[PDB]
Write a protein that binds this ligand. Sequence first.
Ligand SMILES: *[C@@H]1O[C@H](CO)[C@@H](O[C@@H]2O[C@H](CO)[C@@H](O)[C@H](O)[C@H]2NC(C)=O)[C@H](O)[C@H]1NC(C)=O
Ligand SMILES: *[C@@H]1O[C@H](CO)[C@@H](O[C@@H]2O[C@H](CO)[C@@H](O)[C@H](O)[C@H]2NC(C)=O)[C@H](O)[C@H]1NC(C)=O
Ligand SMILES: *[C@@H]1O[C@H](CO)[C@@H](O[C@@H]2O[C@H](CO)[C@@H](O)[C@H](O)[C@H]2NC(C)=O)[C@H](O)[C@H]1NC(C)=O
Ligand SMILES: *[C@@H]1O[C@H](CO)[C@@H](O[C@@H]2O[C@H](CO)[C@@H](O)[C@H](O)[C@H]2NC(C)=O)[C@H](O)[C@H]1NC(C)=O
Ligand SMILES: *[C@@H]1O[C@H](CO)[C@@H](O)[C@H](O)[C@H]1NC(C)=O
Ligand SMILES: *[C@@H]1O[C@H](CO)[C@@H](O)[C@H](O)[C@H]1NC(C)=O
Ligand SMILES: *[C@@H]1O[C@H](CO)[C@@H](O)[C@H](O)[C@H]1NC(C)=O
Ligand SMILES: *[C@@H]1O[C@H](CO)[C@@H](O)[C@H](O)[C@H]1NC(C)=O
Ligand SMILES: *[C@@H]1O[C@H](CO)[C@@H](O)[C@H](O)[C@H]1NC(C)=O
Ligand SMILES: *[C@@H]1O[C@H](CO)[C@@H](O)[C@H](O)[C@H]1NC(C)=O
Ligand SMILES: *[C@@H]1O[C@H](CO)[C@@H](O)[C@H](O)[C@H]1NC(C)=O
Lengths: 185, 409, 99, 99, 50
Amino acid sequence: IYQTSNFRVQPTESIVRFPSTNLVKNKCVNFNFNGLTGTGVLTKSNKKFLPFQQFGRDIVDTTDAVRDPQTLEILDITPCSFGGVSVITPGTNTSNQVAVLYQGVNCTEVSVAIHADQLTPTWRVYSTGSNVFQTRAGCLIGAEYVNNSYECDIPIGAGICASYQTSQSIIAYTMSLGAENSVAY
Amino acid sequence: SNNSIAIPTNFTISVTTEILPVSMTKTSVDCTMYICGDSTECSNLLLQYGSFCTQLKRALTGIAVEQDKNTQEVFAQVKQIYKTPPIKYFGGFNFSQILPDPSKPSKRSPIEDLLFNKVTLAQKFNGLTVLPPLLTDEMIAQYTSALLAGTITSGWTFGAGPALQIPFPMQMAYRFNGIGVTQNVLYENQKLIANQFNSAIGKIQDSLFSTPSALGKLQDVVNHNAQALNTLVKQLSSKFGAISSVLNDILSRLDPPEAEVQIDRLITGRLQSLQTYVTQQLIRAAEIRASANLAATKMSECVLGQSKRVDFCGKGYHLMSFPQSAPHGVVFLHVTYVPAQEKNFTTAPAICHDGKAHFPREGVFVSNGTHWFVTQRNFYEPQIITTDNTFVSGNCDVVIGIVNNTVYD
Amino acid sequence: NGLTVLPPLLTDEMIAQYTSALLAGTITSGWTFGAGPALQIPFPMQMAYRFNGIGVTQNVLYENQKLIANQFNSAIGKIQDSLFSTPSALGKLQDVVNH
Amino acid sequence: SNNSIAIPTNFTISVTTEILPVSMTKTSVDCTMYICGDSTECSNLLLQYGSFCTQLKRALTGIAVEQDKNTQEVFAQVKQIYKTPPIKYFGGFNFSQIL
Amino acid sequence: LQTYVTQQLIRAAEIRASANLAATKMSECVLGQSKRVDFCGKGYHLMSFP
Ligand SMILES: *[C@@H]1O[C@H](CO)[C@@H](O[C@@H]2O[C@H](CO)[C@@H](O)[C@H](O)[C@H]2NC(C)=O)[C@H](O)[C@H]1NC(C)=O
Ligand SMILES: *[C@@H]1O[C@H](CO)[C@@H](O[C@@H]2O[C@H](CO)[C@@H](O)[C@H](O)[C@H]2NC(C)=O)[C@H](O)[C@H]1NC(C)=O
Ligand SMILES: *[C@@H]1O[C@H](CO)[C@@H](O[C@@H]2O[C@H](CO)[C@@H](O)[C@H](O)[C@H]2NC(C)=O)[C@H](O)[C@H]1NC(C)=O
Ligand SMILES: *[C@@H]1O[C@H](CO)[C@@H](O[C@@H]2O[C@H](CO)[C@@H](O)[C@H](O)[C@H]2NC(C)=O)[C@H](O)[C@H]1NC(C)=O
Ligand SMILES: *[C@@H]1O[C@H](CO)[C@@H](O)[C@H](O)[C@H]1NC(C)=O
Ligand SMILES: *[C@@H]1O[C@H](CO)[C@@H](O)[C@H](O)[C@H]1NC(C)=O
Ligand SMILES: *[C@@H]1O[C@H](CO)[C@@H](O)[C@H](O)[C@H]1NC(C)=O
Ligand SMILES: *[C@@H]1O[C@H](CO)[C@@H](O)[C@H](O)[C@H]1NC(C)=O
Ligand SMILES: *[C@@H]1O[C@H](CO)[C@@H](O)[C@H](O)[C@H]1NC(C)=O
Ligand SMILES: *[C@@H]1O[C@H](CO)[C@@H](O)[C@H](O)[C@H]1NC(C)=O
Ligand SMILES: *[C@@H]1O[C@H](CO)[C@@H](O)[C@H](O)[C@H]1NC(C)=O
């Protein structure tokens, strides 16, 4: 397994809310709240702001909340998804088909970015195929999840391995610790 | 004194603990996202430094691989996944606090639950990610349970080949035979000893959660990793001698030829920060690897067999050990043997009989004031002197300190 | 220029006291003071036990006690010379002071 | 040969020495004095370089703390300060050079 | 300053390894009799003094 590059989810449009378009939620979108620049996902929050406070601040230095200039609303700010990209492959002496693992993302967001907007992922022509399985380590594309147990061949994530089955294909499963046994005390 | 000796008349069973870190957090860094972000000019300027980042990526990848290798080496010692019989009777020994609990979905022993609920903790930065470990918590708990089941129902036989069954009291007698105490001591004190053992185990619980500084070693790793990550994140808001800490203001506040130097200063500062972080991580990884090697050795020697090294598997004469899983580490429960209730005695090196010196086979000559007896070293149990338990091998006019008495044939 | 040296927590006399305690314990008790309470035993008897621990019977010591001790004494004397004559023996501790 | 053996008929007592480093020097450094000295302009320029010096001080303090733990682990092996008897007769053995 | 600190850290790690070895030797060769070959001297071990 090798790590090659990184992927980013591009913004769709821009939002201006001077107290001048509408506002969009649950989308990686640019925004500008009276000089407050930056882009990200805006979702409603439950942080009871002070009557004279409008900004937000995380533990160290980054904004994580903002108040709507028009109506009294509290909503969060989240950076758009990013992460590394890994390629799973056997030797070229064996086959030429591969598998891709998007690290630390939910499969639904990747699927929407790929097959709905067709322009958000950084590597578009690079991105092909449709076989989706979701793991705790990220979204795995190009491998069929069997429900058997084998000795680990190519480690992937939290107890998930992959191998070249046998027609010939690439499978993903849960590794087997060992043979079951019980001595009769 | 040079004709006096002390011999214990009672013993004690004591249980201690030991905590060792095993692994640490795995992280990966993206240079362009961290240093530049979404600026083309910054990337073009950074391209002039060559290959300062492939080295960092390789070092971080090596650390990440070594972290998984450490846990694989420490815990994956056996291949068969042994199981314990449904009927939990072992001649009075109660293993409830260490065997897995069926009721809990986590399938963990109560002590493991205490450790997990005690340690606790301390997501997306600017180009900084954390990778999950290869082995989950349930798999580690399964390995620990398999080791416990192997060491309860088989003794040390499963560490050198096929597992061979044996009743538990006979295994304990074998283990007493390994420290210089005869078998009959256990069989005549089987009911008492077990009780002592049970009591010790209970105290262990009250000695873990009540004291807050017991599990400090495992908390230090998490605290240090979080501190390093927070420092690296917070370093991004420093001017480093330039006019601003934001690339956008520098770009859209001055002509490009002047902005080149301002961007270059920030590039140099952030490169220095990354290098410092990577070097510190490398040193800490080396230390953690040394600790993991020590933990693996202790697992191999104290758990899979009986050790004769002094103070290696606990204070006192070693008997056995039990492993428990902890976040980023392991915990050992050493069971030892301690003498008590000594007593004055008078001893002689040899016994003269018909002009012949007599030496004991396995024991020490001891006198209570009137009669002479031969007894084993580590437990007071006098015996009548006989030619069965002595060898002559000498004469009466050589040894210094000989005492002449009678030896019935 | 702001570069200070801190003193160690334990002075040399305390370390000497620890060493003296260890020596007294290993002379007057043997290995019994490291696993519990200390128990008395005459020195020739524990020497016989230590010979028995390497596959040699007891009577070898008791019939050579005068000779063996002599040898031991002589060896100790030579320790006073080899360290004193050769000055490169303590090169391990000097480097720490030097570097 | 397949029917020949050799067995010693006498022995020898030998004493060797071994030297091991344990600890080293504990130091501490002040950034402002070393880098700048007593000029306010240099300090005002230095405070723009982030928190390098906090990390340096923390590392030095960690080393200094570890240096004492090394000695405590090595030497504090016992709980009682055992004392040797006034009369030093141990069957002919002479410990005057080490007591 | 950074170079000095890094070199000091490396030397501290080496000294810690040496101290651990010394502690093990104190535990095994002084408080008991060892059977490990060539660990507490060349020959069959009898005793040691610090
Ligand atoms: C060795 O020590 C044990 C532990 O104290 C002694 O066992 C106790 O004996 C008394 C006397 O009958 C009982 O009242 C206690 O209940 C016992 N303790 C336990 C935990 O059961 C034992 O008697 C001692 N051995 C000798 C020979 O005195
Ligand atoms: C073994 O120890 C367990 C405790 O871990 C005993 O189970 C009972 O546990 C409850 C609460 O956990 C206590 O209030 C009881 O006092 C425990 N019972 C006894 C007899 O002490 C269990 O009974 C013990 N014995 C066996 C054979 O499992
Ligand atoms: C075993 O070796 C010892 C050491 O050499 C022998 O003792 C020496 O014997 C010679 C010859 O009689 C004397 O000149 C020396 O003075 C002795 N040395 C000491 C320290 O007393 C001993 O004789 C040897 N054993 C046998 C059986 O020959
Ligand atoms: C133990 O060894 C020491 C060291 O040799 C002996 O002290 C010597 O004794 C002789 C005779 O009295 C003197 O001539 C030396 O000057 C002493 N040496 C030193 C360094 O003081 C000591 O006598 C020996 N113990 C016994 C009991 O004989
Ligand atoms: C992905 O998003 C869906 C949306 O409902 C959610 O149900 C699912 O739990 C998410 N997966 C992860 C791993 O968070
Ligand atoms: C695999 O696991 C069991 C096997 O019988 C089955 O219940 C489950 O639905 C299977 N999952 C698949 C085929 O995706
Ligand atoms: C040891 O034995 C000798 C015999 O020569 C005697 O003088 C001495 O008092 C004894 N030791 C003690 C402590 O009594
Ligand atoms: C053994 O003898 C010593 C010497 O007087 C004495 O102090 C000690 O109390 C005695 N031990 C017992 C158990 O009486
Ligand atoms: C000493 O042992 C003898 C064994 O024959 C016994 O008769 C005697 O009573 C014992 N002495 C004491 C004080 O118990
Ligand atoms: C037996 O021991 C006594 C006391 O030491 C001694 O007087 C006697 O001579 C010894 N017996 C023989 C035959 O030497
Ligand atoms: C082994 O023994 C045989 C006869 O017992 C003898 O001929 C042969 O030489 C011996 N081997 C060696 C290597 O001496």
